[PDB]
Symmetry: D2
Subunit: 307 residues, 4 copies
């Protein structure tokens, strides 16, 4: 059908919330692909029954066959080793290479979202091996990182979480650049709320640290982050599929923005029917740019080790 | 039932989209009240059948009896003469008085939203005659006025309409204060988009004029505005009912904000389970404040004629 | 964009709720077309601002130009004289002819939904003059008529309205065939609820009469039916657009079902990406079929007068 | 807040999709309670960030303290040993006893949904130890079991999954009673589709076996069922919270229906603001009743071993 076909390359925990949310939102047919035998068929089966509860009609099928990438409109890549961090780099590069090959053969016109960490590295590797246009591949980062910052501020301020807006750029991971100057509450600069003593500078510094360290905080609580990563990816995928043209911070190919080329980094983009319709370059000051540069340098360091 | 009871005092065009949207959103039971015999029963009947299409369960009933205000959780007032403008003032004051009396008797604990124009005048009159607390009554203005500004900018910029945020304050009507400095696009100050030549200052001045004159533009096109007014009111009502704590610009009692007391004017407020949970005072400069003052003066002029 | 283009040929009251609901549901871009100068531009403007409140991104534009049918994915026809009934027949035939011509020229691949009454007559006339395939054009009837029956029963039984299912076939209008034997409550035959004394046969006979006479009841209450007609049409259009494959009772071309050919009549169909994917023929008994025959005869009588 | 408080007693896989869906649907504040230290705080944190993506405002908090049951409006019990089956019975009885004690002390007015298997046994044990009224506690079964049957049929018939309705009664588990006679497609008896050769009797027998064995099929595919169980529970909880009055098949206290008293079994009930508002007794024939009796006997056998 002219229903979108959404192929989830990797059927782990992120894959399993993504499938669930696609059905809840009736976004398209789903393929849960994985290298593990049968498991994705089992998850797919479980998930398919929710069509009833949700009043939806999305097929959800499992796959242990790469050729099921054929005809995909959207491909979401979570496959990769997670278990030092740097030693995994060349192993995951191999995974990106193999997936990129299959994308180039089976669905060269697919919109691709990469999640595999370190995302700003893996997304470019997949970009290079899949051959897809620069506007048709992006990496998960800023939507997810900002959800934490937005949420933490909204709880202090007692407002709707979505009413806090905020920008985190450069890279996903420990070098993420939190931009205090670009935080708003109901469209109003956060500095007004600081001036008013509704939230203090010291509080915000604790929230910034908490934001950066959230994955680690969840892992030390003996859980792992996958629900919010999944919702963020679906917000991105949905903006493409429904041509919403939402402004969403994602890892995209830089061509001069922030003084950087030939690298992917986190910046606000507009996602619509044509993929990345606009790359928005924040007019950073020199102090913010210095931090952006550190993010890019780290991405470059890890990319060099990936080969 | 512990379903909310929502009483629409006035069952005209705004009333009829409001009832429709309450059912679409399953927000609560609806009473379409009006002084016109039977018409609200007819609209209510029509609307009730949509429960099937929407998978909802909201009763929708008509009423020609004020005592059906009893037990209302939310009351929305659109009743009033619309057909000079100033001569209608004392006539609509009489309507606010009569409604306020019935609210005080039948539902003193209701959250009240006033739409009747000029809203910043009528809302205070109803406040005074209903006896309800200052945090439990508000007027429609800024949500609706900003929807126009946000929408027009979003079309120029090719972004999701909701991703433009903007503030219009002071009053509804021709003295509305559009604050250029408080416009953002995906949380980013609009000035960046001006610096970048994505939108010009002259364009924005045309959009500001268009925003102010939108009711008149719709009326000269031989229609009348009621769909968006209705959606805006429901966004407000929904924030209260579901305790969303959205930041929404509404007419509320001023107690010193902007140098003004003992008057209602448009400002961002937070709407939650406790009504107006926060009144947010924008840190306006002297030039913006001068325009705010003109808005208040006009409200005061018309209020004096209402008595 | 690959957003659907939905053209509403007729921008009256039904047209105005349809546009509103398309935006609420983010279903596609909307054109409000009408022969009345400027009015559809005014309604379209009003409606467009709701994109903000709804978090949607659908263009809503007015049109006084038939060529704006070009590229329509879905066309919904409400245009026609409403103000005896039979004398309007040839006048509305002329309207169907003119619209069909423009559909054939501008959007031969559009899915068409006809509302203009008497719908079972007008839909076939449009079918003949537009040249579209039999699976790509349908008429509004059963979804709307059954909404009333389902709703009235659900109120007596104190259950979710959607949990009552029911079939009304043959034609829209006074000859509609209500099939008692095909009513269920939560999938359970209604006869069990009658056996149990939760609802009586005499009650159901009053509900059947009320269902048939609902348009007239609304009109005698000094309103007119347009909200539910609009929601029903959007349920149909949405099933096509999103390939839901809902079972919905609509006027469709009969090719032997119920002993009838070369005529449109109300029966359950399945609406998906391929239009009418299945025509379902209820296995009526001779008594039910006699009533079906009367419905068809009346449609035929009026069709003969249309030429 | 007058937001509902929903306490999930057990924060495993079912608990984690339930929390996610409550936020997606903005249904109320969530507590993920578990005996495992910190894990529910970690899941709760992850889940809380989705408020941003979903435009919701639900708190999601973890808890290792039973007294956080205080003020719960809805309590959902998934805690229990899963790893023969009968040997776990007295162990899980102990868990129901401990939970029931805390419910009686902290939230005697809560609506309770039990999931712990065997559900028809555990729900009655919790009923007895919590002291709550018979209309305020139910067990998960029929909504979930029928989702499978409805889904499998809808795929054969190429219709919207929700348009298949079906009844499975008696008990959850291997003795579930699938009632062929109560299956409909778009409200039309399934036998018509059999008469028409759209689906065969032998196909349906394979689908019935598949339905019964679905948990086992998922487990043999190296997954486990938790997504659909979660969606089904939320459909139930949502019907209560929003007073939808949906007809949903659940385990409830029998007081003579089907010839059975002093036992819980699966039957259609109506869930609204007053809990179980109606217990609906299907008018089973002697052959269907014999199978119902076997279901009850097995529940009774296991209940006897639980003490
Ligand atoms: O590249 S790493 O493996 O060190 C890495 C970086 C960022 C991450 C973010 C998350 S998040 O989903 O919590 O944003 C989870 C795991 C991560 C791993
Ligand atoms: O007070 S007036 O009658 O002049 C007045 C003011 C503002 C208005 C705004 C609208 S709007 O709904 O277009 O915002 C409609 C009618 C209005 C009438
Ligand atoms: O053909 S008539 O003009 O007599 C006719 C038939 C059925 C109708 C149904 C409705 S309904 O929207 O109430 O179903 C409204 C007007 C109608 C007019
Ligand atoms: O009581 S058992 O442990 O044998 C039992 C019964 C029914 C079940 C149903 C499911 S289901 O979630 O697949 O319906 C899962 C586990 C189950 C365990």
């Amino acid at each position: 059908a002219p229903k979108a076909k959404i192929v989830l390359v990797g059927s782990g925990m992120i894959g399993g919330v993504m499938a669930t949310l696609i059905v809840q939102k009736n976004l398209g047919d789903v393929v849960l692909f994985d290298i593990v035998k049968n498991m994705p068929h089992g998850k797919a089966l479980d998930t398919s029954h929710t069509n009833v509860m949700a009043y939806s009609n999305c097929k959800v099928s499992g796959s242990n066959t790469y050729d099921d990438l054929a005809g995909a409109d959207v491909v979401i890549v979570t496959a990769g080793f997670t278990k030092n961090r740097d030693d995994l780099l060349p192993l995951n590069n191999k995974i990106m290479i193999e997936i990129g090959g299959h994308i180039k053969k089976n669905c060269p016109n697919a919109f691709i979202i990469v999640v595999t960490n370190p995302v700003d590295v893996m997304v470019q590797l997949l970009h290079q091996h899949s051959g897809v246009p620069k506007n048709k591949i992006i990496g998960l980062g800023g939507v997810l990182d900002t959800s934490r910052l937005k949420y933490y501020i909204s709880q202090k301020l007692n407002v709707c979480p979505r009413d806090v807006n905020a920008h985190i750029v450069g890279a996903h991971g420990n070098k993420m650049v939190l931009l205090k100057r670009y935080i708003t509450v109901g469209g109003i600069p956060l500095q007004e709320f600081i001036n008013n003593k509704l939230i203090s500078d010291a509080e915000l510094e604790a929230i910034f640290d908490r934001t950066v360290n959230t994955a680690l905080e969840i892992v030390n609580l003996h859980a792992s982050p996958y629900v919010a990563p999944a919702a963020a990816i679906i917000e991105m995928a949905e903006s493409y599929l429904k041509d919403l043209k939402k402004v969403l911070i994602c890892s995209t190919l830089l061509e001069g923005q922030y003084g950087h080329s030939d690298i992917f980094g986190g910046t606000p983009v507009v996602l619509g029917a044509n993929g990345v319709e606009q790359v928005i370059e924040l007019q950073l000051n020199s102090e913010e740019k210095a931090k952006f540069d550190e993010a890019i340098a780290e991405t470059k360091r890890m990319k060099a080790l990936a080969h």
